Design a protein around this ligand. Structure first.
Ligand SMILES: [Cl-]
Ligand SMILES: [Cl-]
Ligand SMILES: [Cu+2]
Ligand SMILES: [Cu+2]
Ligand SMILES: [Zn+2]
Ligand SMILES: [Zn+2]
Lengths: 156, 156
């Protein structure tokens, strides 16, 4: 059994606290918490490669992708491990987050501990972009700027 | 080969950036960087248990101590893994940090990635406290309040 947490901060009035809990036997990880200060609507939500905040959320690098796949949604068989889709901010700017995952781990070589969790300005198109949007869709989901981020740390 | 970084922040005018670099073959880890805003003199420097910033540096918990030992200095055979002794702030409030360690790892079950690095207000007595000071000495080194902290994250 394991627990982690990311405290999201940034330069855009967005903040939050997101917990990760992985069950004994490590099959399922529950990601939950809340994010405030968001424009109402859908916001892209990803675990990024680096837990490096020396350049704000920019130094977090690209999406966490240990298996070298294209970008997708969290339910997709082909996705980045760090792809957590969209969270939904209500009219009051608060998104309550609740995601169950078989792919997000807190133990082992694929652990997301030490990586950054990042919330974005726009909707993640889940790798469904078409036309000239498709290149960036299959890389990042076209979710726009990084509004807040935090390093995923071990929690009690 | 691996690299990590902690960006130290807090409520005391203290900040800094500390890098960790572990060589291929993972025997030696070099910890280096700088911390500013410090009172001149010696400041305790530890990796703590949790990378949890929900309650500032308080939620970092106690020292990282996977082998269940007493507190000591970094050169001691009996110490907490997270015990990094004192860093030294000059008259200008800046401490330049350079520490080599066989005990601090960036890979494996003892990795410090995901834990918090913490700089303290006072000198770490390295577990050498005597009299009524000895109980807290062998726990924390009596280094006083937590001035700044950051979660140790993966770096490029
Ligand atoms: Cl489970
Ligand atoms: Cl080495
Ligand atoms: Cu992203
Ligand atoms: Cu400490
Ligand atoms: Zn992705
Ligand atoms: Zn200690």
């Amino acid at each position: 059994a394991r627990r982690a947490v990311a405290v999201l901060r940034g330069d855009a009035g967005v903040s939050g606290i997101i917990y990760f809990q992985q069950g004994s036997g490590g099959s399922i990880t529950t990601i939950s918490g809340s994010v405030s200060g968001l424009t109402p609507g859908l916001h892209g939500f990803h675990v990024h490669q680096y837990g490096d905040q020396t350049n704000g959320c920019t130094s977090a690098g690209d999406h966490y992708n240990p298996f070298g796949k294209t970008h997708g949604g969290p339910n997709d068989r082909i996705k980045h491990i760090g792809d957590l889709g969209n969270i939904v901010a209500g009219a009051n700017g608060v998104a309550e987050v609740y995601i169950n995952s078989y792919d997000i781990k807190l133990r082992g070589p694929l652990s997301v501990i030490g990586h950054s969790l990042v919330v974005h300005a726009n909707t993640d198109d889940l790798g469904q972009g078409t036309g000239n949007m498709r290149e960036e869709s299959l890389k990042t989901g076209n979710a726009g700027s990084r509004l807040a981020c935090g390093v995923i740390g071990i929690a009690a």
